[PDB]
């Protein structure tokens, strides 16, 4: 994995020694070359995971998250170079350094062979994200949002540190490859109940769980666009990745410890979709949609069937691409009307027809239109939760109805109807904006052709 | 009730609006033209009976129970004209009513496609930006203290001056673009 | 479909409808003939004239505008303003 860590570190002298008009182009070009190179991780096998060294490995779960992570950096550089155009050159290089450094932390977060290295990288991903939100966020609430983002994650993760060091003292190792063969059953006791909570609540905060999601519609809203892209596309999926690793160790106690959290997520996907029906902020509507989509991934990890893991990793990749594109569409209107109020700019299909086509396709992937991998992940989670209990089909179907409702309500509100008369700075769509939309959508549609590379370790 | 010019509806205006609503809903009930014409003359007689009524309280009471009459005898799906609100073709062409300022954002290669149109548009934009400060100072010298009482706009008074706030009334889009 | 309206054609059709109204004789009627001052009509007659204009041209004149159209030239000017004639 060192052949990806070293070029990501070499993006730092590439962004600090570049000419002052070349610091976006060079980082975009070489991060696209790293994203091209990311496809060598598809050397996967049906029995063995691609095990590089004592420190790094990549199974078929970490590999799509890695390719999505290394693909997200040039798109964040494209999205964030217009509103940081008038920035100081040094602060612009600091923003690009925080993006590169967050990618550097993530690509060795997902490949961490040993779990405390995963914890160090996992909590290292707070610091560039916190700096991006609280420094290049736009409104006043970015400082409070950075507080909530920091102090939910550390409140969840500092019991996780004690849990992992306890496993290190008991099993003798936190290597995940050794713990695939030295895993012992975790019986019913109060000690093992709080063991389960300490191993799971950090990732429940990072997904986010319903009831603990209150960091998210302030951190995802008050960030800039690159912060919103990385938070929606990768940093929620760190939680699901950690769950799919750490639920190896939590059996059979998960089979009754999962019930309150399965209730919280099965009811939170209804409640947050209902919240999306009544949002005035478009960016907050996309934030609560992200909570609504990650609730299904939480249920799919907690029921731990193979169909549920396949649907959960497919839905994680699909939601990363879809939510990143929805935030970029929201930014493309915010850079014209300078307001996140959804009812302000109306009738935009009369003005921006191809951008409205991108709105249509992202709203169709948001409502899980087949054969998109959105529908593949959605559908496999619904199959596995039906096999779990036959009455969960009511909640899954009601969630799908409300999901279609807020997706097409977002589309109709922003794009349809009579246009707003007093708004006259609606520029045509720039080539940068349409290129950003297509670089989100076209991989998301091409992955419907060959979807087996995003279905996890147990496809 | 709700008007841009007046603050209320007079009694006479309420009677006329009732008479028009009653004839339209009657025409919905009485589809054929001769039969509608018969019953519309009967309704005209029912309005001409209490026409010369000088007691405003008695006329107000007759207006109120005539509204109860109309409410009990309205067509549930009355005939609406197509471009009238509620009609099957209402606000259909609003997706084709692109505003005038979107022509300013065209590329010059498609402004070169219509040279005389944009050359004739620049004198409209010039005329508007010389009319603007004069029509602002026209509005501020005629409006009383405390702001305007009604939404009525005053016309232009000098020669060479355009009426105040004329641009988004004149340069509104057509109904069939 | 939908042939364009001219001010000549609109004025001819409006005066054509008002000449088919028994409370207006056609030899007095002109475009400036005020319905209450000159032709001596009631406000009920004005509401019926507006409804005949609506049935003639196929669109509704609202009552805030229908209470004010008191000569045929005002009616022709309003139908011009709401149909955008002489493009």
């Amino acid at each position: 994995m060192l052949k990806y860590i070293i070029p990501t570190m070499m993006l730092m002298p590439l962004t600090w020694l570049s000419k002052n008009s070349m610091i976006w182009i060079n980082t975009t070009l070489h991060s696209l070359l790293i994203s091209l190179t990311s496809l060598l991780l598809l050397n996967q096998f049906g029995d063995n995971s691609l095990n590089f060294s004592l420190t790094f490995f990549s199974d078929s779960l970490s590999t799509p998250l890695l390719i999505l992570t290394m693909w997200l950096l040039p798109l964040m550089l494209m999205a964030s170079q217009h509103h940081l155009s008038k920035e100081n050159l040094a602060r612009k290089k600091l923003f690009i350094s925080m993006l590169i450094l967050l990618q550097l932390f993530l690509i060795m977060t997902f490949t961490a062979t040993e779990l405390i290295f995963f914890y160090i990288m996992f909590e290292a991903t707070l610091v560039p994200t916190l700096i991006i939100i609280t420094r290049w966020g736009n409104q006043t609430e970015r400082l409070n949002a950075g507080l909530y983002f920091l102090f939910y994650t550390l409140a969840g993760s500092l019991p996780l540190l004690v849990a992992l060091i306890y496993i290190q003292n008991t099993m003798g190792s936190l290597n995940f490859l050794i713990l695939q063969y030295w895993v012992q059953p975790m019986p019913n006791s109060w000690s093992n109940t709080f063991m389960w909570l300490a191993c799971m609540m950090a990732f429940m905060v990072k997904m986010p769980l319903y009831g603990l999601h209150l960091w998210l519609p302030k951190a995802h809203v008050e960030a800039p666009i690159a912060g919103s892209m990385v938070l929606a596309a990768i940093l929620l999926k760190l939680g699901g990745y950690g769950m799919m690793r750490i639920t190896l160790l939590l059996n059979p106690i998960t089979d009754f410890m999962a019930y309150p959290f399965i209730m919280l997520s099965l009811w939170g996907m209804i409640m947050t979709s209902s919240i999306c029906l009544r949002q005035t902020d478009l960016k907050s509507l996309i934030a609560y949609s992200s909570v609504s989509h990650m609730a299904l991934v939480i249920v799919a990890i907690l029921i731990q069937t193979p169909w549920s893991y396949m649907g959960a990793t497919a839905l994680m990749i699909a939601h990363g691409l879809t939510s990143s594109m929805l935030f970029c569409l929201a930014n493309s209107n915010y850079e014209r009307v300078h307001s996140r109020t959804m009812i302000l700019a109306r009738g935009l299909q009369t003005l921006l027809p191809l951008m409205a086509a991108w709105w249509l396709l992202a709203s169709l992937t948001n409502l899980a239109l087949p054969p998109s991998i959105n529908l593949i992940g959605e559908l496999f989670v619904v199959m596995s939760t039906f096999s779990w209990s036959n009455i969960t089909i009511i909640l899954m179907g009601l969630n799908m109805v409300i999901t279609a409702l807020y997706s097409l309500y977002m589309l109709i509100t922003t794009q349809r109807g009579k246009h707003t008369h007093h708004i006259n700075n609606i520029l045509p769509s720039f080539t940068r904006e349409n290129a950003l939309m297509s670089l989100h959508m076209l991989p998301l549609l091409l992955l419907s052709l060959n979807p087996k590379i995003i279905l996890g370790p147990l496809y | 009730a709700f008007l841009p010019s007046a603050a209320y509806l007079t009694h006479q205006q309420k009677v006329l609006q009732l008479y028009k609503r009653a004839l339209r809903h009657l025409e919905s009930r009485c589809v054929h033209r001769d039969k509608y014409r018969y019953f519309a003359c009967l309704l005209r007689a029912r309005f001409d009976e209490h026409k010369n009524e000088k007691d405003m309280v008695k006329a107000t009471q007759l207006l109120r129970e005539a509204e109860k009459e109309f409410w009990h005898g309205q067509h549930p799906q009355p005939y609406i004209f197509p471009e009238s609100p509620g009609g099957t073709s209402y606000e259909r062409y609003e997706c084709y009513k692109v505003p005038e300022w979107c022509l300013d954002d065209w590329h010059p290669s498609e402004k070169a496609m219509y040279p005389d149109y944009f050359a004739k548009r620049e004198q409209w934009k010039k005329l508007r930006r010389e009319s603007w400060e004069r029509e602002v100072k026209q509005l501020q010298e005629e409006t009383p203290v405390g702001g305007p009482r009604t939404e009525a706009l005053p016309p232009a008074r000098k020669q060479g001056d355009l009426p105040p706030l004329w641009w988004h009334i004149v340069t509104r889009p057509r109904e069939r673009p | 479909d939908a042939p364009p309206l001219t001010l000549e054609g609109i004025k001819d059709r409006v005066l054509y409808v008002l000449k088919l109204y028994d409370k207006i004789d056609p030899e007095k009627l002109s475009v400036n003939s005020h319905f209450m001052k000159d032709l001596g009509l009631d406000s009920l007659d004005q509401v019926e004239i507006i409804m005949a204009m609506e049935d003639e041209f196929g669109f509704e004149i609202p009552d805030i505008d229908a209470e004010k159209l008191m000569c045929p030239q005002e009616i022709v000017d309003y139908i011009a303003d709401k149909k955008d004639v002489y493009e």
Binding site: - | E110, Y117, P177 | -
Partner: peptide
Amino acid sequence: GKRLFIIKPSGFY
């Protein structure tokens, strides 16, 4: 004849 100009947003980009 009497062709009317059709105001439409900028389709060049």
